[PDB]
Paper text:
Here we present high-resolution structures of the A- and B-capsids and in-situ portals of human cytomegalovirus. The portal proteins are believed to orchestrate nucleation of the procapsid through the formation of a portal–scaffold complex, which facilitates procapsid assembly. During the maturation process, the disassociated scaffold proteins are expelled as the viral DNA is pumped into the capsid through the portal located at a unique vertex of the icosahedral capsid. All three capsids possess a mature icosahedral shell and are distinguishable by the inner capsid material: (1) C-capsids are filled with viral DNA; (2) A-capsids appear empty and are assumed to be products of aborted viral genome packaging; and (3) B-capsids have a featureless inner core consisting of scaffold proteins, likely generated by an unsuccessful initiation of DNA packaging.
Thus, the portals in B- and A-capsids represent to some extent the pre-DNA-packaging and the post-DNA-released states, respectively. Using high-resolution C12 portal reconstruction of the A-/B-capsids, we built the atomic model for the main body part of the portal protein pUL104, and showed that it consists of the wing (residues 52–90, 168–193 and 239–286), crown (residues 91–167, 194–238 and 570–647), stem (residues 287–314 and 528–551), clip (residues 315–322 and 485–527) and β-hairpin (residues 552–569) domains. The main body of the DNA-devoid portal has a hollow central channel with three constricted regions harboring interior diameters of 30, 33, and 73 Å, respectively. Furthermore, the portal main body of the A-/B-capsid locates ~20 Å inward; in contrast, each of the 12 monomers from the portal main body of the DNA-filled capsid rotates inward. As a result, whereas the crown domain shows the greatest movement (up to 7.9 Å) toward the central channel, we noted a gradual decrease in the movements of the β-hairpin domain (with the tip sliding by 5.3 Å), wing domain (an RMSD of 2.10 Å) and stem/clip domains (RMSDs of 1.28 Å/1.88 Å). The portals from the A- and B-capsid resemble each other and are arranged in a symmetry-mismatch fashion different from that of the virion: a C5 10-helix anchor, a C5 portal turret, and a C12 portal main body. A portal structural comparison of the DNA-free and DNA-filled capsids shows that the scaffold fragment binding cavity of the portal is closed off in the virion capsid, suggesting that dissociation of the scaffold fragments from the portal is necessary for the required portal conformational changes during DNA translocation. Given that the portal in the A-capsid, which somewhat represents the post-release state, is identical to that in the B-capsid both conformationally and positionally, we believe that inner capsid pressure generated by the packaged DNA causes the conformational changes of the portal.
Residue numbers in the entry:
A (entry chain K), B (entry chain L): 52 to 320, 488 to 635
C (entry chain J): 250 to 320
């Protein structure tokens, strides 16, 4: 038996998941936590990384090789003035859109079948309120690897039917595809009851265990510890814990005092109410909250009374706490507010510092990070499908279609002149 | 036994890390401390330093040497009008992009594997609240140096695969890479309980010891000391300690006076409420906060009463303290406020004076400072990957690509004319 | 939610059926488990608003008469 200071199952910390999901208190600033826990930015950045590693491979050779088949496939190019200048652009658009829908359908299938893990939507909570995440590594029989390796072939058959030329990149990088698929379904966020995490005091090598079994864990922001043996956190949400405690105390206090003096006079010594007419309501309300006096006996020392009627003003410190929440979440991750002219809070989105602080640590512990790349920020706002049309636009893929365009127009301009 | 005046484990200073992380005091100002303890600016500045030291080395010779391989690799350049003017730019962009992704992936791997130390966050706390930092120098066996020297090769193999020419810079500067990697994991921020720092009175050579063992420490702003044996600090946070302590006293005072006059009348002589309807709630409210009189016996001297109902106005001095926090942190570190037109507090970021005050002292005591260079302020806002593209754009790397493309176009313009 | 094997299921009238999950809620020593859905973030506030609505109605319906006397 060893003495070890614990962090998880106490009121200060188990209350954190209650408040951050608003079990006991909330305000107008809680929605920015909701826009922080978007699970779709995970699949967006993930597909951006895998397609950036996909498209950049065979840009230099395969375009001139697959020019040959579509040369005979489109019988054209009689005159150099009007046919050549217009045919190359629509052929280039055709090839890029066909490989685009191919990779889009294959990636949408292999995501939507087994990337609905919704674990990031707890991972950002553990990153934001304790500065570390408990997480389990579920292991299975290697027959499930054969299940996924079978499934990816019928997945890429939808791209095979769409495009013959798109399948050549996928048959090259199927190892990377099955790698990110297996590492995708390998690790969870450990939402299981009676978990316990702690800090070992004699060697500062704090560890996570689940149900008596020691597990792996990640640390992003370790909290500071001193002679106060309950240690203090550097995490963002603990910077505003006591303020929402004050707001919740004021909320309950306001409620319990406004339900205290409902009756009009004091001396000392169910939507049914709307439906029925007022002549039964005056009978039922007068009998409903009964008049009750209040008295304690005291002989030859009589009462001298005073009286107070007030409710606490919730709106002032409500606005104060919402402004504090908004300022806090804006400073700790630099959330942008793109609006129109004279527009107020149209849309709030992840920005450049934000994805580096939260998303790339997720892919760091996922250990798929060795190939991928963080997404541009306006690229994050764009569609699930339109994103790849800009992703290879960033790549040298259509930039080499520019080079084969210049080569074909030069080879035919010398043919004319 | 010697008498030595201590600074660390007293109420004025143990209170400091509690108030700065908001265990007691809080307002809209604490978020600017959160934007000051952002640890990613450390990794951005250090990667900027190592890539600026990287890219300027072999600018003058290797570009003309590696022109030779991509001359035969791209069969082109038949006509001088359209082929030369367009091919050279995309070749230059391809080369800079490929070496960029190579150094980016290698640096991201060697960062994300062992630069999640998050020590900078506490380092800026000790710089801001006591003007000096305690820190330990952990030393291990040299087998860990061999582990890192093994790990960097498999790290730069990811750059070796994508680009052959990028490995030649890394094999030249691998000593610098292992140096900054070893000095990266060399020192910590001393987050261990029961440490003690003090000032020796007879010899003014103030020192830090950890658990009976004397250690090294850094001093940035030593506090002034006089015949008052408790000494006064010149640090920024002690300039406004008493005001947030006043705010905390007023907050607790407001809470305790608001929770005192809850009952409507006075004489002299947990969401349980919301769910349940009002008719049992009015039963539970009167029994919940019971009426209590107050009485002291006094014969032939009777009571003559008075009454006060007031709450303290928290919002006025709250706004005062937030403006205090805002202009205080603005003047001590010249933080910029870039916004849009009619824009209020979009983003706050380090400027040129701020990094010189807080970051380069960190790299000074790191002792990797002899080869690096501070980052421009607008460069700090940019992406984790986009930063290197402007980093060698500042360098003469692509500036010599301008010289070699002018040389190629001159050598072929003389070939034509 | 089946407690020993975390493989929560849907049954209809004694017959087990299929179901979909999009956002699974977090579960702990509190055997009533807490939800991460958008609407549960604002359950208590609209419940407070309804308590205030009913309370306003019942206090307005209480002091309708212009004069009140005691005895």
């Amino acid at each position: 038996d060893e003495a070890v200071i614990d962090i998880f199952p106490t009121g200060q910390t188990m209350s954190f998941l209650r408040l951050l999901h608003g079990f006991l208190g909330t305000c107008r600033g809680q929605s920015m936590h909701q826009v922080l826990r978007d699970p779709c930015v995970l699949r967006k950045q993930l597909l951006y990384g895998v397609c950036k590693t996909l498209f950049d491979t065979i840009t230099v050779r395969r375009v001139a090789e697959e020019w040959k088949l579509h040369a005979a496939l489109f019988p054209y190019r009689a005159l150099d003035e009007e046919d050549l200048e217009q045919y190359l652009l629509v052929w280039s658009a055709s090839l890029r859109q066909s490989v685009q829908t191919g990779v889009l359908g294959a990636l949408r299938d292999i995501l939507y079948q087994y990337a609905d893990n919704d674990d990031y939507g707890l991972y950002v909570d553990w990153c934001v309120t304790v500065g570390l995440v408990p997480l389990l590594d579920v292991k299975t029989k290697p027959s499930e690897a054969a299940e996924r390796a079978q499934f990816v072939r019928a997945a890429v058959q939808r791209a095979t039917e769409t495009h013959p030329l798109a399948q050549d990149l996928l048959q090259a990088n199927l190892a990377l595809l099955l790698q990110v698929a297996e590492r995708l379904g390998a690790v969870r966020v450990a939402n299981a009851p009676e978990v316990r995490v702690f800090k070992k005091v004699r060697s500062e090598r704090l560890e996570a265990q689940l149900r008596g079994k020691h597990i792996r864990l990640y640390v992003a922001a370790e909290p500071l510890a001193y002679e106060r043996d309950k240690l203090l956190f550097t995490t963002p949400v603990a910077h505003l814990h006591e303020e929402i405690l004050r707001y919740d105390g004021l909320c309950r206090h306001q409620k319990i005092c406004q339900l205290l003096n409902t009756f009009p006079v004091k001396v000392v010594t169910d939507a049914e109410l709307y439906h029925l007419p007022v002549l039964e309501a005056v009978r039922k309300a007068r009998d409903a909250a009964p008049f009750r006096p209040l008295a304690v006996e005291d002989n030859r020392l009589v009462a001298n009374s005073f009286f107070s009627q007030f409710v606490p003003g919730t709106e002032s410190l409500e606005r104060f706490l919402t402004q504090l929440w908004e300022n806090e979440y804006f400073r700790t991750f630099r959330l942008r507010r793109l609006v129109t002219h004279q527009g107020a809070e149209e849309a709030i989105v992840y920005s450049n510092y934000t994805v580096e602080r939260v998303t790339l640590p997720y892919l760091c512990h996922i250990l798929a990070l060795g190939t991928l790349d963080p997404v541009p920020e306006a690229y994050l706002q764009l569609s699930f499908g339109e994103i790849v049309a800009a992703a290879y636009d960033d790549s040298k893929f259509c930039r080499y279609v520019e080079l084969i365009c210049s080569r074909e127009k030069a080879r035919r301009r010398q043919m004319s002149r």
